[PDB]
Design a protein around this nucleic acid. Structure first.
Ligand code: MG
Ligand code: MG
Lengths: 257, 29, 374, 253
RNA sequence: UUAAUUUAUUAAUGCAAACACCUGCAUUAAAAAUUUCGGUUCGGAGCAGAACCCAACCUCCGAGCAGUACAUGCUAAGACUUCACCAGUCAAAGCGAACCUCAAUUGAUCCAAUAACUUGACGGAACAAGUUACCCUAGGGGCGCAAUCCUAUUCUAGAGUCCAUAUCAACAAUAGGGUUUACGACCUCUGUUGGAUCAGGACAUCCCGAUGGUGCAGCCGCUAUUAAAGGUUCGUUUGUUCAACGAUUAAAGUCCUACGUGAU
């Protein structure tokens, strides 16, 4: 049991959760939540340690979820300091850090946890079968990221170790790469992203899309797709644009044009 | 203030350290 | 000093454990402790949290040492009793009593309304009988009406917040509680309004009074700096927010920013607390309308100083002995100048040593209180 | 620049921004962020007071964007208490086949602002909310909305009663829920006027409104979820419904 | 005036009334009108094995009850009094007799109904901004010089561990800055977050040094002690000490210094 919040294991867990460079150097990530831990175990992640507070250890179901991993009882203050959320999740796991016509979405550059979680929830709603993002230092099990995903981020098939370099290699198949920007006009609904496979590349809201990716989208047989802005606002949120693009693709794959 | 008894107070000497060592009124007589 | 009181080795060891906060008895404590150990029925008005509870308890412990255990037979009531007007004050008193009685043989218990009566009337709570019991008047009256407690077995009674116990809501239940009349009665308070003291004369016979500090209106503590609010109420909360911005400086230096807010009405306290929690302030509110478990949790947090901002209703104005009390804001100025002074003495309750900040808002009804501010 | 950290401008700004009920009492909103303030100014929001931070006025580009607002140079403490943001702007708070997006009950402000940006992108002709408990002057709602709510027909006092009286025209009241399956794209909400009702995230869809949607000539419309997630985001679902309706009114079916 | 409140009055609507005009009722404004701008949920078994208590979004049975009654006599002094009465109460002497079940089965004030009895989901003041450096009456109190600050300081009394003269220093005293007070009226009616800069301090050390144990064969580690002598990067988004991004590093540690340092 861990009652003292100043324990070295608790300090190491807090350093790993708070710092993504610590997660990259230690090769370990922390996922808070019994449902999140179950989704990680089902997705193929191998847990190395299980953290159970005074509430989830009494359940003994999360103790069954360790599957041989190290289980340590945690006090309330230890759980509160260790978890990056205001509400500490009772069950946590410290682990080692496509279908036909699949929807592949590539998120370049740095992205906020709220925007990433909203994009994950919208993609789960639409039913995207492939997600590529930045390199391995980005953790989708962060409390802001996990809370923003509403459990859909743990439930979606997203690759967090894709990186900007191997994403063209991971999407070198027969998928038309398209650039989504306000200066792209073809239109978003005027694309063949549903009748054939699509590898959608979208930049950050405040980070933008790279010019090389925009050139490569035209190079990869696709065309630049723009959203017609009837209003006076030049750009909306990137998550809303991704949700609209996923909805248009799902509608056009559901028999629309 | 506080008025205590002028003479010897009742049940004072028979207390002692060992209260259970008292013979006790086993009979009501 | 304390050794002049003839403290027992448990009492002397507990007093030594109270060091460096207790190296000798206070002058008011010196005046109070052995006269109570002389058994005289008396009332003492002094500084809040000045060790007066300890001064009353030490003589009470000495008197209980002279009491036989045969009166501690099953089903009877306690011989040492204490009264508090609030469940929080009674809980704090019971917590203080349980530390001293850990090295002693006195059993310490607490009784208040709105709590589990099964645990209150438990076989090791009501029937087994305790030496020290602090009880609210409502729970005690319910127990006496239901014959769950008695009043002929008492021998030493203590009336904490006796002026607050002299409330019109509180006087009738106390008189109903009032019972062997030969028991030693000691009352403790901060000040004695005259119209209640003669009420004590309704049940008094050659008692004694022990007063501390200035005999005049002892409104200003020499260790407390006070200010007058020369502004209207409309931005005053905003000014309080500005004071909160000033308290932001108090949040910056680590010098403790435990803030206690005086609010007259529980619903007004709720509205102000919703505003403050909206204003991203770590505020917890305690009131007479709060849930009993919620109030207990909030009181435990304030004892741990978990919430640096805490609002209090009329239920929680006086009697507080809170560690680290550095910020006190009368968000509502108290309707009684005695109540305002009692709220002022609730902060900095470690004594004349621990400093603190006091700021009081000024409203139109409190305009006549400005002359009281003089 | 103001000498006191509790300045009356600073105190009023912190009161209006921090407390959205105080924002409703004051009738003002806060544009927070240079990109957000630019989007609000382009979206038609007219600021009433301006706060320019210590390094924001050094560039002075945003000083060109004022064009007549009350410009106060913003120092340390006002910016810090205003940070929830150095370019701070204190601003004032049925067509043929009309498109109305109705968010039932109260909701979180960030999701509400994202939904407002999505509705601005789609081009909905009406934004409908709950009763007086729903606040559109929240600074978080303004920040996530990117100032678009000033350009949208949004009314937050419509309530469960008068909004049904506000939509007594021939609008097909469509029920949008996870248990609706008709489908969202399988509805006639684009060929005719529609009254699309979206329930709250923490309150859900009212059974009376769900019964009235089927009663008022519409049908229950559900979003098909291939995955294992029980419900998607309400803002994402509303954006998907608005995009499907705009597509089907743009020549699709 | 976006203090408060109306709205006598218009102007709109809408609704009435009459068949474009008039009157009435609501709302909205414009404009007004009236008044404010203070002082110094509840139980049984286990977790909880032998006076209490004990914990889990702990392990199982349960509860929003049901059934069964309403000497619990009569007479009779003397008292309390709902601030009147009414209504209510206490009770001595006498006549006539003795000498609820349940296992939980429930909750609180407040607003209701009810004439009431009864039935419904731990302390509870009547209210109003800012200006008048125009308000009005009435009350309460350059030139002359350095008397003052003035410094290449003399006699050295004296401190400065000794040592007047490393340094300071009083009494009187060579004197003569035009920056301060007037004297004459000489030409006249307690500022604030980063950042730039400079950084000082601590180890509770991120690395390096020295070690002990290690689930330390070795490489990598972990723990603990000692060590502040030293450093602890560069850029992107965002003005945020944090956060996301890449290249890193032996490490990119933390804070304090008015959350260091704007009399620029
Ligand atoms: Mg008198
Ligand atoms: Mg006098």
């Amino acid at each position: 049991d861990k009652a003292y919040p100043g324990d070295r294991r608790l300090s190491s867990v807090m350093t790993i959760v708070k710092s993504r460079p610590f997660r990259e150097k230690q090769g370990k990530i922390l996922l808070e939540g019994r449902r999140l831990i179950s989704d990680a175990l089902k997705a193929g992640a191998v847990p190395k340690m299980f953290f159970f507070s005074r509430l989830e250890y009494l359940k003994e179901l999360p103790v069954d979820k360790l599957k041989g991993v190290s289980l340590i009882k945690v006090k309330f203050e230890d759980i509160k300091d260790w978890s990056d959320l205001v509400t500490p999740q009772g069950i946590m796991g410290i682990f080692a850090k496509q279908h036909s016509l699949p929807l592949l979405l590539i998120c370049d550059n740095l992205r906020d946890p709220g925007n990433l979680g909203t994009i994950l929830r919208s993609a789960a709603g639409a039913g995207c079968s492939k997600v590529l993002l930045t390199k391995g230092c980005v953790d989708a099990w962060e409390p802001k990221v996990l809370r923003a995903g509403m459990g859909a981020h743990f439930r979606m098939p997203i690759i967090n170790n894709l990186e900007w370099e191997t994403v063209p290699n991971y999407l070198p198949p027969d998928t038309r790469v398209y650039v989504a920007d306000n200066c792209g006009l073809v239109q978003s609904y005027d694309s063949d992203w549903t009748e054939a496979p699509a590898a959608v590349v979208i930049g950050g809201e405040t980070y933008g899309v790279s010019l090389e990716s925009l050139q490569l989208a035209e190079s990869t047989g696709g065309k630049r797709l723009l959203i017609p802005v009837v209003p006076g606002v030049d750009s909306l949120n990137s998550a809303m644009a991704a949700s609209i693009l996923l909805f248009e693709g799902k509608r056009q794959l559901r028999g629309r044009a | 203030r506080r008025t205590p008894p002028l003479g010897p107070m009742p049940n004072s000497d028979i207390d002692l350290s060992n209260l259970e060592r008292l013979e006790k009124y086993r009979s009501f007589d | 000093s304390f050794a002049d009181l003839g403290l027992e080795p448990r009492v002397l060891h507990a007093l030594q454990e109270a060091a460096p906060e207790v190296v000798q008895p206070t002058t008011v404590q010196s005046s109070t402790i052995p006269s109570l150990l002389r058994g005289r029925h008396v009332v003492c008005a002094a500084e809040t949290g000045s060790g007066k509870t300890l001064s009353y308890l030490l003589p009470l412990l000495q008197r209980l040492l002279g009491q036989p255990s045969l009166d501690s037979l099953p089903i009877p009531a306690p011989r040492g009793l204490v009264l508090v007007p609030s469940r929080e004050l009674a809980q704090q008193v019971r917590a203080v009593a349980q530390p001293l009685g850990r090295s002693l043989g006195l059993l310490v218990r607490d009784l208040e309304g709105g709590h589990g009566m099964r645990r209150i009337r438990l076989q090791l709570s009501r029937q087994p009988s305790a030496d020290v019991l602090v009880a609210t008047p409502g729970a005690l009256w319910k127990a006496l009406k239901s014959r769950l407690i008695s009043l002929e077995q008492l021998s030493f009674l203590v009336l904490d917040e006796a002026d607050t116990l002299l409330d019109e809501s509180f006087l009738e239940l106390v008189d109903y509680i009032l019972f062997n009349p030969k028991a030693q009665l000691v009352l403790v308070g901060a000040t004695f309004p005259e119209g209640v003291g003669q009420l004590l004369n309704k049940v008094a016979s050659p008692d004694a009074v022990t007063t501390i500090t200035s005999s005049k209106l002892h409104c200003i503590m020499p260790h407390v700096k006070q200010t007058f609010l020369r502004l209207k109420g409309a931005d005053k909360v905003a000014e309080l927010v500005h004071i909160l911005k000033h308290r932001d400086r108090a949040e910056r230096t680590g010098p403790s920013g435990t803030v206690l807010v005086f609010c007259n009405s529980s619903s007004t306290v709720n509205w102000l607390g919703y505003i403050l929690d909206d204003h991203k302030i770590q505020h917890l509110r305690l009131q007479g309308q709060m849930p009993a478990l919620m109030r207990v949790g909030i009181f435990q947090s304030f004892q741990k100083s978990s919430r640096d901002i805490l609002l209090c209703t009329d239920i929680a104005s006086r009697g507080l002995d809170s560690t680290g009390v550095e910020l006190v804001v009368n968000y509502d100025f108290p309707p009684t100048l005695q109540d305002y002074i009692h709220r002022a003495g609730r902060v900095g309750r470690v004594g004349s040593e621990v400093p603190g900040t006091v700021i009081s808002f000024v409203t139109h009804p409190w305009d006549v209180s400005l002359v009281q501010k003089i």
